[PDB]
Amino acid sequence: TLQQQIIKALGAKPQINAEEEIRRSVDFLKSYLQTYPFIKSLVLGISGGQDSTLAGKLCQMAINELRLETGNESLQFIAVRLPYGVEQDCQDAIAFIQPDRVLTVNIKGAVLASEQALREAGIELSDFVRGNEKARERMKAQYSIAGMTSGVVVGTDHAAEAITGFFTKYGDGGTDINPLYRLNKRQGKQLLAALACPEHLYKEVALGVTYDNIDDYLEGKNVPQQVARTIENWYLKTEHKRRPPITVFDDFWKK
Numbered sequence: 656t657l658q659q660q661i662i663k664a665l666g667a668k669p670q671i672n673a674e675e676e677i678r679r680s681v682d683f684l685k686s687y688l689q690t691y692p693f694i695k696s697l698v699l700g701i702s703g704g705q706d707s708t709l710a711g712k713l714c715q716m717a718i719n720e721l722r723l724e725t726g727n728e729s730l731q732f733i734a735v736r737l738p739y740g741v742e743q744d745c746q747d748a749i750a751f752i753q754p755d756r757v758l759t760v761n762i763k764g765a766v767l768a769s770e771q772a773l774r775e776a777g778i779e780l781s782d783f784v785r786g787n788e789k790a791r792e793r794m795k796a797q798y799s800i801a802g803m804t805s806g807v808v809v810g811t812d813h814a815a816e817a818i819t820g821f822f823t824k825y826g827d828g829g830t831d832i833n834p835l836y837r838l839n840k841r842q843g844k845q846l847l848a849a850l851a852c853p854e855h856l857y858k859e860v861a862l863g864v865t866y867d868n869i870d871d872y873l874e875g876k877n878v879p880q881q882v883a884r885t886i887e888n889w890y891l892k893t894e895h896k897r898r899p900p901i902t903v904f905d906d907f908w909k910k
């Protein structure tokens with residue numbers, strides 16, 4: 656079935672052990688940094704929501720352990736707040752993560768500048784397209800920071816978003832390493848609970864399904880046929896987002 660094929664492709668599991676997965680992600684980040692010792696920083700955009708808070712906690716834990724283990728005082732986790740103009744949840748998230756450094760970059764000025772240049776050329780953006788533009792400016796900011804701090808950009812992509820391609824191509828989807836990949840939405844909550852994250856930090860119509868529908872599907876459960884079709888429709892439609900640019904050698908789009 657397509658469901659079984661998708662589940663395999665995304666590495667999703669019906670049930671996971673919170674603590675064990677926490678260590679799998681942390682050990683992953685630690686191992687990567689020890690393999691590429693020129694990397695001195697982990698950069699992650701924080702929004703005060705479930706995904707970035709979970710990833711952020713794991714990143715700081717990885718950095719904390721590597722410091723104690725190697726003695727390298729130069730390693731650091733950089734949390735980046737990227738507000739558009741002018742949110743107490745972000746402060747709470749920060750207090751929970753206890754990041755080594757927090758940088759605040761307001762992307763409004765740049766986004767308005769990009770839109771003005773486009774407008775003068777004859778292109779007016781719809782609010783929808785402006786949203787992706789915002790996501791890409793956030794990507795740009797994080798990569799500039801990584802470039803100046805010898806770091807890599809950590810992504811928050813997970814199975815529940817990868818399956819529907821619910822991310823901006825080269826926007827929040829533009830990252831270097833994704834420690835949450837394989838987990839579904841509710842499983843991400845499990846990890847946060849295990850980390851004692853303040854409940855309110857992890858507690859939109861675009862899709863024709865709910866996150867419970869998506870997580871159930873990813874867990875291999877029997878869902879109403881039309882819900883399965885909707886989910887698979889999104890998956891098939893967004894394969895280009897989960898693969899490198901298309902070349903004359905590719906044939907996946909021909910099926």
Ligand SMILES: Nc1ncnc2c1ncn2[C@@H]1O[C@H](COP(=O)(O)OP(=O)(O)OC[C@H]2O[C@@H]([n+]3cccc(C(=O)O)c3)[C@H](O)[C@@H]2O)[C@@H](O)[C@H]1O
Pocket residue numbers: 691798801802806807808831832
């Ligand atoms: N090992 C690793 N594993 C995972 N991620 C890694 C990584 N090393 C770096 N990264 C990530 O990638 C980033 C570095 O890559 P990138 O941002 O490309 O930076 P970089 O590789 O330095 O790209 C710039 C080079 O491309 C040339 N360029 C660019 C564009 C157009 C043209 C032209 O001729 O028209 C030439 C430019 O002249 C220069 O030689 C790092 O900051 C980090 O975010």
Ligand SMILES: [Mg+2]
Pocket residue numbers: 706707811816
């Ligand atoms: Mg997310």
